[PDB]
Design an enzyme around this catalytic site. Sequence first.
Site, PDB file in Angstrom:
ATOM      1  N   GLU A 131       0.820  -1.244   0.000  1.00  0.00           N
ATOM      2  CA  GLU A 131       0.000   0.000   0.000  1.00  0.00           C
ATOM      3  C   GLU A 131       0.831   1.261   0.000  1.00  0.00           C
ATOM      4  O   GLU A 131       0.604   2.240   0.700  1.00  0.00           O
ATOM      5  CB  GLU A 131      -0.983  -0.018   1.207  1.00  0.00           C
ATOM      6  CG  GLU A 131      -1.972  -1.230   0.994  1.00  0.00           C
ATOM      7  CD  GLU A 131      -3.031  -1.414   2.039  1.00  0.00           C
ATOM      8  OE1 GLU A 131      -3.014  -0.449   2.982  1.00  0.00           O
ATOM      9  OE2 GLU A 131      -3.724  -2.345   2.068  1.00  0.00           O
ATOM     10  N   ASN A 172       2.521  -4.839  -3.301  1.00  0.00           N
ATOM     11  CA  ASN A 172       1.109  -5.208  -3.213  1.00  0.00           C
ATOM     12  C   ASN A 172       0.277  -3.946  -3.005  1.00  0.00           C
ATOM     13  O   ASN A 172       0.670  -3.068  -2.221  1.00  0.00           O
ATOM     14  CB  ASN A 172       0.941  -6.162  -2.039  1.00  0.00           C
ATOM     15  CG  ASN A 172      -0.391  -6.854  -1.945  1.00  0.00           C
ATOM     16  OD1 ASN A 172      -0.826  -7.467  -2.914  1.00  0.00           O
ATOM     17  ND2 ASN A 172      -0.984  -6.790  -0.772  1.00  0.00           N
ATOM     18  N   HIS A 209     -10.047  -6.124  -3.791  1.00  0.00           N
ATOM     19  CA  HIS A 209     -11.192  -5.960  -2.915  1.00  0.00           C
ATOM     20  C   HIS A 209     -12.308  -5.261  -3.686  1.00  0.00           C
ATOM     21  O   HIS A 209     -12.267  -4.050  -3.811  1.00  0.00           O
ATOM     22  CB  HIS A 209     -10.810  -5.186  -1.663  1.00  0.00           C
ATOM     23  CG  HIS A 209      -9.834  -5.884  -0.760  1.00  0.00           C
ATOM     24  ND1 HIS A 209     -10.137  -7.030  -0.110  1.00  0.00           N
ATOM     25  CD2 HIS A 209      -8.562  -5.573  -0.409  1.00  0.00           C
ATOM     26  CE1 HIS A 209      -9.105  -7.443   0.621  1.00  0.00           C
ATOM     27  NE2 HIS A 209      -8.128  -6.560   0.459  1.00  0.00           N
ATOM     28  N   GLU A 237      -5.734 -10.688  -2.418  1.00  0.00           N
ATOM     29  CA  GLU A 237      -6.627 -10.525  -1.269  1.00  0.00           C
ATOM     30  C   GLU A 237      -8.092 -10.459  -1.763  1.00  0.00           C
ATOM     31  O   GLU A 237      -8.865  -9.635  -1.301  1.00  0.00           O
ATOM     32  CB  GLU A 237      -6.286  -9.309  -0.426  1.00  0.00           C
ATOM     33  CG  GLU A 237      -4.850  -9.201   0.010  1.00  0.00           C
ATOM     34  CD  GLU A 237      -4.556  -8.089   0.860  1.00  0.00           C
ATOM     35  OE1 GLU A 237      -5.501  -7.409   1.418  1.00  0.00           O
ATOM     36  OE2 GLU A 237      -3.349  -7.785   1.099  1.00  0.00           O
ATOM     37  N   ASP A 239     -11.858 -10.519  -2.514  1.00  0.00           N
ATOM     38  CA  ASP A 239     -13.184 -10.678  -1.976  1.00  0.00           C
ATOM     39  C   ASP A 239     -14.082  -9.766  -2.795  1.00  0.00           C
ATOM     40  O   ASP A 239     -13.640  -8.812  -3.437  1.00  0.00           O
ATOM     41  CB  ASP A 239     -13.245 -10.488  -0.456  1.00  0.00           C
ATOM     42  CG  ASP A 239     -12.597  -9.245   0.101  1.00  0.00           C
ATOM     43  OD1 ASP A 239     -12.510  -8.226  -0.598  1.00  0.00           O
ATOM     44  OD2 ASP A 239     -12.071  -9.309   1.236  1.00  0.00           O
TER      45      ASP A 239
END
Length: 302
Positions: A131, A172, A209, A237, A239
């Site tokens: 990030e 990432n 995400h 990650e 979802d």
Amino acid sequence: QAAQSVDQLIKARGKVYFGVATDQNRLTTGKNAAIIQADFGQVTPENSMKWDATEPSQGNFNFAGADYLVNWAQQNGKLIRGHTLVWHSQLPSWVSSITDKNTLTNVMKNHITTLMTRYKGKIRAWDVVNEAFNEDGSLRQTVFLNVIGEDYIPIAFQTARAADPNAKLYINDYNLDSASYPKTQAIVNRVKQWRAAGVPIDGIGSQTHLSAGQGAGVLQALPLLASAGTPEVAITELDVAGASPTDYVNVVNACLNVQSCVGITVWGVADPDSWRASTTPLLFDGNFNPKPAYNAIVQDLQ
């Protein structure tokens, strides 16, 4: 557990893994371990390898949770992604209190080296820097950027490569899900420039995400990320709010379409344990049964 394993099926399509986030608290409860054993091929520690867990006072390391996960993964034949070395969140107060560049550089290097050496040769990939970008594509002004400067990214990657040359080293980030979004283009451009300067960035990780309907854009964004020329990209990650099959199938197909996409990690097993549980965004429900999106992925892969 589902009888059909998305990891076995994605391997049969030529990819490396389909995995999940977990940790000791999940593995000792419910049906999480059984599902991971049967259906997934890789694990990422949700929290046990972050800086707050592992170095809560300088030079006073705590590996209990991380050791648990690594030992479990090795016993069960699962790949591990280490997560995460340098991140502004979940960062102890003793680190953010340091204002001296030499001191913070040495602390950062020692944190990287100590973690990576403990698990040398056991970790497929590490999220070295997490990030690091703002939404407009500029670099996020964190304590590392403010005190060390832009060179903190090169330093982190070079240190990581020295500590464990077996591991693939990733940057990432999230909101890399649309090709026209400035963050997406910026990380491509910066990674290209860093690698041209000899910085060892092996992968771009795209957290993914998503909100409902956003899967379609990943079909164009993931090839764009791959155009930076890293050896690997990965969905790290995943979802999806609402867990629509349409969104999940699009993300899987995006990875299938991109030769350098090695695999997918979904960010937990069962909906109630999600960090976004109110959006029921995972592949198993609260009773640990596979959802329509799980079965749609199976059908797509077969």
